[PDB]
Nucleic acid binder design. Structure first.
Lengths: 147, 145
RNA sequence: UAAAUAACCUGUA
RNA sequence: UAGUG
């Protein structure tokens, strides 16, 4: 919102295949989310309409102990982490080209568990590693407490 | 978040068991004024009902000097650390089972009954603490100034 | 351009 | 053994 985060804006010419994946974290909670692409690619820098669909959006709030497990994987401390809750069933494994987060998640205003899978490769795996190793260290409230 | 600001940086290692409340505990690992403080909480009621799930049992206050020692273990250098006070006799060591995991076994008294307990640390909960401590020591040495 | 259906409060000694 | 915003 005015949180630590990084988004990957993948917009295609085929509106059905573009997405905006956002990874941000509030304190000890990581929020992984993805909205689909709403129709065509905007082309007017002045056009302030929605480019991604906030209604078919995928949102998943993870636990604090999870954020930890995720780093594990990045550090090979755990081959693959599998979390399970009411709204989704995901896995996060290391790949020779990056990371893979997948499972069956579910969009807002839905109850239709759909097969899902997002990937972080090359220069994006990097980006993601730094965000995670950082979320954790700052997830304890030391910086704010001493400020 | 107005409250989590002015409060003890801390991180809880959770192990509830509504199935068999004979293994229900919640440790808050906090750092209060150069104090790595452990609060082993016990489960007195289930997740499914309303109320205060956890109930605080014994509070082990750890002195600043310990961080480096505990870390010396979490980092694979020492094979164990010992704590001691008129109220506790606890131990943290590498759990032989799986690598990167650790066990904390504290045998506390209470005013003479020995309350003992034991909290395991999975490869992630270990990494959890591992960072929590590095941070403190970090600020303790006063780098944040 | 978020996310969304309420309750893991501390000190004191 | 004990008590409170």
């Amino acid at each position: 919102q005015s949180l630590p985060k990084f988004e990957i804006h993948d917009v295609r010419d085929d509106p059905a295949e573009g997405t905006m994946t956002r990874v941000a974290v509030d304190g000890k909670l990581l929020l992984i989310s993805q909205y689909p692409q709403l129709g065509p690619r905007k082309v007017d820098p002045n056009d302030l309409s929605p480019q991604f669909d906030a209604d078919r959006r995928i949102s998943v709030r993870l636990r604090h102990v999870d954020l930890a497990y995720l780093v594990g994987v990045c550090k090979e401390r755990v081959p693959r982490h599998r979390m399970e809750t009411k709204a989704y069933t995901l896995d996060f494994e290391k790949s020779a080209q990056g990371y893979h987060l997948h499972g069956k998640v579910h969009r807002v205003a839905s109850q239709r568990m759909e097969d899902w899978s997002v990937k972080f490769d090359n220069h994006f795996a990097v980006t993601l590693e730094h965000f995670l190793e950082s979320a954790l260290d700052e997830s304890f409230g030391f910086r704010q407490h001493y400020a | 978040r107005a409250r989590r600001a002015q409060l003890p940086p801390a991180f809880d290692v959770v192990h509830w068991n509504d199935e068999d409340i004979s293994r229900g505990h919640l440790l808050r690992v906090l750092h209060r004024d150069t104090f790595v403080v452990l609060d082993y909480h016990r489960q007195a009621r289930m997740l499914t009902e309303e109320g205060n799930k956890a109930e605080r049992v014994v509070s082990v206050m750890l002195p600043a000097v310990y961080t480096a020692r505990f870390l010396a273990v979490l980092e694979g250098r020492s094979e164990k650390v010992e704590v001691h006070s008129r109220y506790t006799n606890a131990t943290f060591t590498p759990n032989p089972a799986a690598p990167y995991t650790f066990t904390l076994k504290c045998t506390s008294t209470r005013p003479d009954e020995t309350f003992e307990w034991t909290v395991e640390f999975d490869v992630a909960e270990s990494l959890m603490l591992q960072r929590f401590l590095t941070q403190a020591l970090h600020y303790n040495t006063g780098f944040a100034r």
